Design a binder for this molecule. Sequence first.
Ligand SMILES: NC(=O)C1=CN([C@@H]2O[C@H](COP(=O)(O)OP(=O)(O)OC[C@H]3O[C@@H](n4cnc5c(N)ncnc54)[C@H](OP(=O)(O)O)[C@@H]3O)[C@@H](O)[C@H]2O)C=CC1
Ligand SMILES: NC(=O)C1=CN([C@@H]2O[C@H](COP(=O)(O)OP(=O)(O)OC[C@H]3O[C@@H](n4cnc5c(N)ncnc54)[C@H](OP(=O)(O)O)[C@@H]3O)[C@@H](O)[C@H]2O)C=CC1
Ligand SMILES: CSc1ccccc1N1CCNCC1
Lengths: 534, 523
Amino acid sequence: EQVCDVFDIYAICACCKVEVFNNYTFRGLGNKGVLPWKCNSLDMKYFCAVTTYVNESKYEKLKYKRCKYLNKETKKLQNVVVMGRTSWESIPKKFKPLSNRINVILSRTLKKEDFDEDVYIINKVEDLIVLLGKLNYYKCFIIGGSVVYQEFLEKKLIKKIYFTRINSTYECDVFFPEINENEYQIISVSDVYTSNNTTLDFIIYKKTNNDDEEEDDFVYFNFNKEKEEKNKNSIHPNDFQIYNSLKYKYHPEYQYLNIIYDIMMNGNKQSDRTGVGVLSKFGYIMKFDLSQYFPLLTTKKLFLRGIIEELLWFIRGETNGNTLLNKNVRIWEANGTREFLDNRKLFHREVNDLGPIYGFQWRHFGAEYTNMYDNYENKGVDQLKNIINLIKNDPTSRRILLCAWNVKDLDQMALPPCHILCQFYVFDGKLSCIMYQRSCDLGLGVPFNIASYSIFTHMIAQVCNLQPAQFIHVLGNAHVYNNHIDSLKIQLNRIPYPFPTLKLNPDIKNIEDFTISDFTIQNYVHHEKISMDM
Amino acid sequence: DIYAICACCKVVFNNYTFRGLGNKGVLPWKCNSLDMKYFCAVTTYVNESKYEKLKYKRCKYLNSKKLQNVVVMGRTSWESIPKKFKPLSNRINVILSRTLKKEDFDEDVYIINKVEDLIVLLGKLNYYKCFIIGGSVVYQEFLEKKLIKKIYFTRINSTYECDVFFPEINENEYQIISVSDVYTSNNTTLDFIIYKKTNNDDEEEDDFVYFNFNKEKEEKNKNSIHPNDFQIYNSLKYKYHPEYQYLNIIYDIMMNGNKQSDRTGVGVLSKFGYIMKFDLSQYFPLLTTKKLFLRGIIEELLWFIRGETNGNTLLNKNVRIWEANGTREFLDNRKLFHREVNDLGPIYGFQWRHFGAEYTNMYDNYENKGVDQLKNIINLIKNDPTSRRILLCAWNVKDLDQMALPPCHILCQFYVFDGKLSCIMYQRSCDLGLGVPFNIASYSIFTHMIAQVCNLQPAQFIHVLGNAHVYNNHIDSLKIQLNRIPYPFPTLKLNPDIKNIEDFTISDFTIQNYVHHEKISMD
Ligand SMILES: NC(=O)C1=CN([C@@H]2O[C@H](COP(=O)(O)OP(=O)(O)OC[C@H]3O[C@@H](n4cnc5c(N)ncnc54)[C@H](OP(=O)(O)O)[C@@H]3O)[C@@H](O)[C@H]2O)C=CC1
Ligand SMILES: NC(=O)C1=CN([C@@H]2O[C@H](COP(=O)(O)OP(=O)(O)OC[C@H]3O[C@@H](n4cnc5c(N)ncnc54)[C@H](OP(=O)(O)O)[C@@H]3O)[C@@H](O)[C@H]2O)C=CC1
Ligand SMILES: CSc1ccccc1N1CCNCC1
């Protein structure tokens, strides 16, 4: 029975990045006696919530345990907070003492007499442990600063860390102690939020190894499922240790990563026209909150330049592969070759002429396609203009779809579009986008697709004078390639970082007027590159 | 800790419609492999590391370690069991009796003089919980003697011959608090419901609260609905019946939906992006919480497949789904001043068989003009099962303005695996109160139809909702529906002989064992 479990001693801190990314990139605590960031409202509200939360039921078990360990026998309940003097003098004087909590301050230079407020002054750690045997309290929170943090981990007196990752860089002179992957391991990671123009999430470290007759009902109703051998696929335990060890997976990136797992664990084995080899499943939905982040996957490096050039290329209505290839974007290069077009029976189509695909269908749906050099001036339906006009003027229309699946033109296309349709939704001056994907490459393709349509929602929202809200991705045929597996296993065992943010040059007001430099990914912190294949 | 278990089949409907227990000293149905397995696992399970708390309960009322449960039946129900089955493998069997004695039977097995004298053995024996498989009279005797504190009821959704029945459970005295998944075994639908006696690292649970620190609802009703009215809904512990996919999206939109006023000014709660998945190999998902009729939507489905846009064809069969959209007035408001009345334009039927053709009028022969997409998806299912290009798309962008209205149902996508066919239908605009029930049936049928002509087995129908709305003046009606407890789902029997998608006729479609609550007027 170590002292932290009996007396429930925890740390809560908030760290920013300081002027190969790792989890000791988040480590900036304070600058010139204050926070590097000035105020974070959500970091504050989380801190208030965690440190002021008690549950009176549980107390009697704790009051017991505490009497057990400490060889003893059988106001409204509060938690303890414990801070350094510097940290205490850093607090606004109307906010001190921290309300509805037991304030404990570590100081040598200052005795009790030096303090007006209702606080407990102590001059060493051993004394805190004394006071926690003398007091009625729920949980003890160590709230810093740097010296108090370092000391308490030093003595292995902390049982969990409540770690806020403020996903921006600021000037810092005090740092959080480095954490050993050995001694402490992340068991939980939260949703990403935006506050005060930065993203943040909340992760929990744990100290490492080194009315109750209706429980059963669940077992009954689960009598007809699988075995461990009708859990379909062999793909083992150990190979997702860090994934399965996680308790709460509330980061949105686990939306994508859980589907990987479901396909891997529960996928159907198929071999396409190719003779390749996949695990596939049918019909999922991912919702991302664009108002709170830009969901660029963090469990591997992603380059956004090419997929942005491609979006602008569509918006122009271009079907000309050369255009991309001059800008050094090879997305559509293998779909533009003599061989590929010849195997598509497109014998009369020019090299890199991809035909009536996204560009055309968005600007000119149902015009007879000629070649990539034709301007289709006022021919067919300008869907893109149409949807921008319906968002402006009829935001409660249920007919705001942009659709790339023109049945008439499929055989004329290099490939039929994987991204069938975008439908739009407007509420309270905010814009959401459903995108339906017929076929989905989970290992290589979906990461870019999420980003792509996520940027497109921002673009539309901007020129329609609305705020971006939810991007909703609907997967039809959801497959993992068999050779993608080894690399996807590596990725599932990586804990996401807080998402980056996307900034669009605000001056752009028409959908046609966006250039590569109008886009900026701020604060993309990410695990290292993975070659999906081998 | 005394609960009964049973299976009951059929003999307008309420819950009690399920009562048939026995025919001529045996079961009305022959034998159900999954009902026996459930029945088995319910009485094969004892909570390992719990119940020392009932060495401090039963012994503080009445002043080995293999640890099975009791399994209390009667002579009539002891004689009913086959020889090889008895005694009930790995269970403490009792028999309530008069005529029997312990000098025709063993000491491992037991009997009791009467039900009062059961507590003689109960206050003498060692187990966890008392399971009563009983019978017509061994059940009735534990309802009138209010002994039973829960039932583990199988509902067999078939009608047999019966001499014995179950005692009608008392509308107040007991109430269902859990409904299972619906399944198929021995060519019947069945589900599993639990009835209750009315009272009339523990670390990482605060971690939950801390993560739940930024959720809006401070008791302030996010929407104006009074959940105090879904008491039966909110009471339900496990809501595993698939009809709860529908009902749970009704709940969500009511409680968290955005208040919007349409053109008319009608008023709706709306959300964006849902999925419902129905397992058509275990049931036909025809909502049970309100009477649904299907002759109309099946005839609408045949019409589409024929390539018709002639409204009159449907109206002459008293299918009026497309009536209001055919009027001089509706077509004029669509700016369709040159469209004949009940000429609905290049809608579903025209797009399914002639996508890209130039629509003339509803009477023109379009034979061999435009893309025959229906034909093409059936060919793709057949010649390219593993293709990811198997779509049937009714949203032709060049043709929208020519249509009486654009298709509410955008596209069907088809997946084939291990001789089984699953279908996604993405719906752009979803009236949850009225239209979506029909949408779920209409497209579930379509899957069965496509599956049979392709020599495949229906697997999943998957319903994707875009703009998902409840009309404000449906709210009272849906609140009623949310407190009704789904029945077991019916089945769909397609005439096995029909092998062209185009050869189906209304008579080739029978819904079977369709049990449902009274009809509701959404208003
Ligand atoms: N981002 C965050 O979550 C947090 C940030 N902060 C920031 O961190 C900085 C303050 O932390 P840092 O400068 O280390 O200062 P600390 O808050 O850790 O204060 C250290 C001082 O407290 C006293 N102290 C510490 N340990 C003991 C001990 N064992 N016995 C007796 N006294 C002890 C001493 O005071 P004395 O000199 O009187 O002996 C010591 O000099 C500020 O910039 C503040 O804004 C603070 C908390 C949280
Ligand atoms: N659906 C299900 O889960 C199950 C259904 N069944 C079926 O249903 C029927 C089984 O039950 P049902 O036929 O009533 O038979 P029961 O199970 O009700 O058997 C009751 C027997 O116990 C004795 N008894 C009855 N009342 C008393 C009393 N008040 N005091 C003392 N002894 C009493 C009598 O035996 P005596 O006087 O002769 O000693 C009587 O024959 C069969 O058709 C069987 O196949 C069987 C099991 C499960
Ligand atoms: C604990 S010092 C403090 C004093 C006054 C307000 C907030 C803090 N916090 C908690 C949020 N994270 C930064 C430190």
